[PDB]
């Protein structure tokens, strides 16, 4: 729908809180920050020697936290390019995430270890509790306010811990209807409200109200607000997330390079965006405050946007853009 | 044969919101078009005036737009809904409307014939500001950056600095030519960083002052401008000028060629000229508050001039 020609070997991407900038982690170990206002590069960071597989913006928009494949986790100053701090873990890192209300805390999700929460100023840490003991593969997410941490393991068990104490305050196993378990591949929260979604190995996206889970308490059976799946092709989902307002959900099918978009409330498929057929889908993000979606496939970023009813059905004045490509400088 | 020429709008005036995600554009048909930098298309259209809108200003919080038409009507618009919040009828036309940069309950209106007026909108009191010598034909004015002072300038080159709340004269001076004649003050613009501002005068010289030096000087001072900027080759007069977002550059639109001149403020040096399509009349210019982007309106068409940082790579097959 319009790809970015200035960025190559894209691997992961995330918007800042206002969606003026797009941080793009790349296969060459660089973070390239693209600017929605100038439609050009804002900042390049030489961040690793190994591919950048995970990024997260601090709430104040000044810091980036990244993870390599060398098991390094670094915090960057987006203005200066400087590395404020750097941690090396045993085993590789799936996910890094700032505490949403406190950028001194970051959550790390290692491959074979339990999840770890750090504080950057005092280089202290917590390893978080774990249910099946042989969890090994566990993913975790702060909730929208950062007062709880949700985890999911390979056996379909969701722990709800309180971020300060790490105390189990709610839990439930996610059901295949049958009774067989199903692995949790990711947990994502809406930017507005209390809803979150779970991507699972049975290829059904489950939408839950966070409060519905707290009420159900320890070892509950909360029922999903919504169950999203593709019953034609039974497609697996590479990545899912909410719209910034939280009432739509996009999920990327790598298998058929397409993005499905449902309504969260009612549940019906609203539309499917098809990219080229050669390419493999790597990442998807939804703009925090606009009907814009970013896609990475085969190292190319694609922006999908939606303008309102007008744009010439309204006989508006003409807009022309004159762009002056200049060389990136620090 | 014709048809769509009848209803397509001409842009006449434009202004960025505080973060430069939105460009508000006023048109000949009274509409206000809100253009979105993030999606690169129109977000909203406000059906605002019966007549061309000529002045526009965004509130600090981004939710309200104040606008002036050729009806001598000053309206406040709620941008999310598109509803009018409040309307004023003036006698004589309006040159300029401006929100107080820190308190959007106050609006400065500059009528052509009259002296400038400051509205409080929670309750609609106005209060005329003082004017010297009563050449009150063509008084221009502007809040300074934080809105503690209003700066006025008249057709005889007299600049007053007034306290905003108390309205009391705290500094003044008179801008003269190299021949000790006065020249008319055509516009006043403050930068978004620092305390410098600029004036466009009828003698085709943009003067840059430090507002700190001017308060220091007090009533009937002689402060000298930090910079005097002008077309040395063609002596073009200036339709409109303003600072870059950080205050280090000044753009100035030629009233006689579709051309934008850009100087570095500190050393007064002219670094580039943007030539629009030949033959068009330049109507407005705005520098983006936080980016190297300039919007300009000429012959009803909006132009976005943007620098885009790229790397040198390109394809080989």
């Amino acid at each position: 729908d319009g790809t970015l020609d200035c960025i190559s070997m894209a691997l992961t991407c995330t918007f800042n809180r206002w969606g003026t900038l797009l941080a793009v982690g790349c296969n060459d170990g660089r973070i390239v920050i693209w600017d929605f206002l100038t439609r050009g590069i804002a900042k390049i960071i030489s961040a690793h020697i190994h591919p950048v597989c995970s990024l997260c913006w601090s709430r104040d928009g000044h810091k980036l936290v990244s993870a390599s494949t060398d098991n390094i986790v670094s915090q960057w100053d987006v203005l200066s390019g400087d590395c404020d701090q750097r941690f090396r873990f045993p085993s590789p890192i799936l996910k890094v995430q700032y505490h949403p209300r406190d950028q001194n805390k970051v959550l790390v999700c290692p491959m074979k270890s339990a999840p770890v929460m750090l504080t950057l100023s005092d280089s202290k840490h917590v390893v978080l509790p774990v249910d099946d003991d042989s969890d090994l593969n566990v993913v975790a997410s702060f909730d929208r306010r950062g007062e709880y941490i949700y985890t999911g393991n390979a056996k379909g068990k969701i722990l709800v811990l309180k971020t300060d104490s790490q105390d189990l305050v709610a839990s439930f196993r996610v059901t295949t209807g049958t009774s067989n378990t199903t692995a949790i591949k990711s947990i994502e929260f809406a930017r507005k409200g209390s809803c979150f979604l779970i991507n699972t190995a049975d290829r059904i996206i489950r939408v839950y109200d966070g409060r519905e889970i707290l009420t159900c308490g320890r070892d509950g059976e909360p029922e999903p607000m919504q169950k999203l799946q593709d019953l034609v092709n039974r497609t697996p989902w590479k990545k899912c997330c909410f719209s910034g307002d939280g009432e739509y959900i996009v999920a990327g099918s790598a298998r058929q390079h397409a993005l499905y978009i449902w309504e969260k409330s009612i549940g019906n498929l609203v539309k499917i965006l098809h990219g080229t057929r050669g390419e493999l889908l790597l990442d998807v993000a939804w703009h925090p405050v606009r009907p814009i979606i970013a896609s990475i496939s085969s190292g190319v970023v694609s922006i999908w946007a939606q303008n309102q009813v007008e744009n010439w059905s309204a006989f508006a004045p003409d807009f022309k853009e004159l762009d002056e490509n200049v060389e990136y400088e620090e | 044969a014709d048809g769509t020429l009848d209803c397509i709008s001409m842009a006449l005036t434009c202004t960025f919101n505080r973060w430069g995600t939105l460009l508000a554009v006023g048109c000949n048909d009274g509409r206000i078009v809100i253009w979105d930098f993030l999606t690169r298309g129109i977000a909203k259209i406000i059906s605002a005036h019966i007549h061309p809108v000529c002045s526009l200003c965004w509130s600090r919080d981004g939710h309200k737009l104040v606008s002036a038409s050729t009806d001598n009507i000053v309206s406040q618009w709620d941008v999310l809904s598109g509803d009018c919040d409040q309307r004023f009828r003036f006698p004589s036309p309006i040159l300029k409307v401006q929100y107080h940069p820190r308190d959007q309950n106050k609006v400065l209106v500059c009528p052509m014939k009259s002296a400038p007026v400051m509205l409080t909108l929670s309750d609609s009191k106005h209060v005329v500001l003082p004017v010297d010598d009563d050449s009150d034909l063509n008084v221009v004015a502007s809040f300074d950056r934080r809105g503690e002072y209003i700066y006025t300038g008249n057709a005889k080159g007299k600049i007053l600095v007034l306290k905003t709340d108390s309205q009391d004269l705290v500094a003044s001076f008179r801008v003269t030519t190299g021949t000790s004649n006065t020249t008319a003050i055509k516009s006043i613009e403050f930068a978004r960083k620092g305390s410098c501002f600029l004036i466009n005068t009828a003698d085709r010289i943009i003067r840059v002052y430090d507002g700190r030096e001017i308060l220091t000087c007090g009533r009937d001072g002689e402060p000298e401008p930090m910079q005097k900027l002008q077309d040395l080759v063609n002596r073009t007069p200036w339709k409109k000028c303003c600072f870059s977002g950080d205050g280090e550059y000044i753009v100035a639109g030629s009233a006689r060629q579709h051309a934008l001149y850009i100087w570095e403020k500190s050393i007064g040096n002219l670094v580039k000229i943007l030539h629009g399509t030949r033959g068009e009349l330049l109507l407005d210019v705005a520098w983006h508050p936080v980016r190297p982007i300039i919007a300009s309106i000429s012959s009803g068409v909006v132009s976005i001039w943007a620098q885009n940082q790229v790397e040198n790579w390109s394809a080989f097959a």
Partner: peptide
């Protein structure tokens, strides 16, 4: 001191 045009 450049110039750009169009």
């Amino acid at each position: 001191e450049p110039k750009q045009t169009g």
